[PDB]
Structure formats: structure tokens, C-alpha cells
Design a protein around this motif. Structure first.
Motif, PDB file in Angstrom:
ATOM      1  N   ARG A  99      -2.605  44.706   3.166  1.00 59.41           N
ATOM      2  CA  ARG A  99      -2.711  45.354   1.871  1.00 59.41           C
ATOM      3  C   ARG A  99      -2.349  46.825   1.950  1.00 59.41           C
ATOM      4  NH1 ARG A  99      -8.697  43.596   1.720  1.00 59.41           N
ATOM      5  NH2 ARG A  99      -8.197  43.834   3.947  1.00 59.41           N
ATOM      6  N   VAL A 100      -2.388  47.383   3.156  1.00 57.53           N
ATOM      7  CA  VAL A 100      -2.039  48.783   3.344  1.00 57.53           C
ATOM      8  C   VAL A 100      -0.520  48.956   3.269  1.00 57.53           C
ATOM      9  CG1 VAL A 100      -2.146  50.788   4.859  1.00 57.53           C
ATOM     10  CG2 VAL A 100      -4.048  49.181   4.822  1.00 57.53           C
ATOM     11  N   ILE A 101      -0.059  49.607   2.213  1.00 56.34           N
ATOM     12  CA  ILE A 101       1.362  49.848   2.040  1.00 56.34           C
ATOM     13  C   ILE A 101       1.779  50.956   3.004  1.00 56.34           C
ATOM     14  CG2 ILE A 101       3.142  50.634   0.444  1.00 56.34           C
ATOM     15  CD1 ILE A 101       1.282  49.485  -1.799  1.00 56.34           C
ATOM     16  N   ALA A 102       0.960  52.005   3.070  1.00 57.51           N
ATOM     17  CA  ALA A 102       1.210  53.150   3.942  1.00 57.51           C
ATOM     18  C   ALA A 102      -0.096  53.882   4.187  1.00 57.51           C
ATOM     19  CB  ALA A 102       2.239  54.077   3.320  1.00 57.51           C
ATOM     20  N   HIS A 103      -0.131  54.671   5.254  1.00 55.31           N
ATOM     21  CA  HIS A 103      -1.340  55.396   5.594  1.00 55.31           C
ATOM     22  C   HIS A 103      -1.092  56.512   6.595  1.00 55.31           C
ATOM     23  CE1 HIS A 103      -1.656  53.791   9.710  1.00 55.31           C
ATOM     24  NE2 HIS A 103      -1.247  52.640   9.225  1.00 55.31           N
ATOM     25  N   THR A 104      -1.843  57.604   6.461  1.00 57.75           N
ATOM     26  CA  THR A 104      -1.765  58.686   7.438  1.00 57.75           C
ATOM     27  C   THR A 104      -2.891  58.319   8.396  1.00 57.75           C
ATOM     28  OG1 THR A 104      -3.496  60.070   6.409  1.00 57.75           O
ATOM     29  CG2 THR A 104      -1.221  60.389   5.663  1.00 57.75           C
ATOM     30  N   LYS A 105      -3.067  59.076   9.466  1.00 62.12           N
ATOM     31  CA  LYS A 105      -4.187  58.770  10.352  1.00 62.12           C
ATOM     32  C   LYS A 105      -5.387  59.552   9.826  1.00 62.12           C
ATOM     33  CE  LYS A 105      -2.514  62.117  13.722  1.00 62.12           C
ATOM     34  NZ  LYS A 105      -3.643  63.006  13.333  1.00 62.12           N
ATOM     35  N   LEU A 106      -6.568  59.311  10.395  1.00 59.02           N
ATOM     36  CA  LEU A 106      -7.758  60.023   9.961  1.00 59.02           C
ATOM     37  C   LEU A 106      -7.717  61.402  10.603  1.00 59.02           C
ATOM     38  CD1 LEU A 106     -10.407  59.119   8.353  1.00 59.02           C
ATOM     39  CD2 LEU A 106     -11.520  59.365  10.567  1.00 59.02           C
TER      40      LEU A 106
END
Ligand SMILES: [Cu+2]
Ligand SMILES: [Cu+2]
Length: 128
Positions: free
Chosen positions: A79-86
Motif C-alpha cells: 500500500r506504500v506508494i512512496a516513503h522517506t525514512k524515519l
């Protein structure tokens, strides 16, 4: 148009942006996340995660259950299209994703998956 957006996550669990418009003319779109706060990522970590407004909840829910060492993101979550790191205080990170992974009409939501943050730290993203 502007195929990038600079975002900030703070100590008050706040993003400095609530709406993101992605111009249909961009082949790629970039989000530049920074953390102007003083708190480390283990107490006030922030990431920028994108998913359809409908997939948000399960992503947040499973993300919190995954732990810090997994950036509060379930591994291999489709479901994650895109993401930066924490990231924590003083840190920064950018994510670039293909605009073709988005479709017009459908509503998207960007949010932080750190436990409890998504309640304040969320927003809208639409393909225009
Ligand atoms: Cu342009
Ligand atoms: Cu956060």
C-alpha cells in the motif's frame, strides 16, 4: 510545474504542509523532508509516507506494530506508494517517485507512521 515539495516535521508533531498537488506533467515528484526539532527519532521521529486515502489506516496500524528498526513501516507493505525514512532532529531525507504510480480522481494521503503522529501529522495529495 513544481515537481518537488520541501516539508518539515517538528517537535509539536506537525508537518508544515497539509495539501500536496502533483502536476500531471511531472514524470517524477520529489519530497524533501527535514526535521527542525530537537528531539531524536526514537521519541519524535518523522517520515513522509504516501498511500491512497483508503489504505492509510492499515499502513499506520501495521507500521506502529513493526518497530523503530523497521521505520514504523510493515516490511514489504504494498500500500506504500512512496516513503522517506524515519528521521530525527537535525536530519533530512528525500524521496522521489514515478508520477505514473498515481492516477487522477483518486485521493491520496501523506502521513507519518511514528506511533500516534498520523493523528496530527497527515495531509492530502492529489494528481492534478
Ligand atoms: Cu515544471
Ligand atoms: Cu512523526
Amino acid at each position: 510545474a513544481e515537481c518537488s515539495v520541501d516539508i518539515q516535521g517538528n517537535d509539536q508533531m506537525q508537518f508544515n504542509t497539509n495539501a500536496i498537488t502533483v502536476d500531471k506533467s511531472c514524470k517524477q515528484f520529489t519530497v524533501n523532508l527535514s526535521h527542525p526539532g530537537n528531539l531524536p527519532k526514537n521519541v519524535m521521529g518523522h517520515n513522509w509516507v504516501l498511500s491512497t486515502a483508503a489504505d492509510m489506516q492499515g499502513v499506520v496500524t501495521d507500521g506502529m506494530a513493526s518497530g523503530l528498526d523497521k521505520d514504523y513501516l510493515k516490511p514489504d507493505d504494498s500500500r506504500v506508494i512512496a516513503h522517506t525514512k524515519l528521521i530525527g532532529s537535525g536530519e533530512k531525507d528525500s524521496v522521489t517517485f514515478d508520477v505514473s504510480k498515481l492516477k487522477e480522481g483518486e485521493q491520496y494521503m501523506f502521513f507519518c507512521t511514528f506511533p500516534g503522529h498520523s493523528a496530527l501529522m497527515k495531509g492530502t495529495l492529489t494528481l492534478k
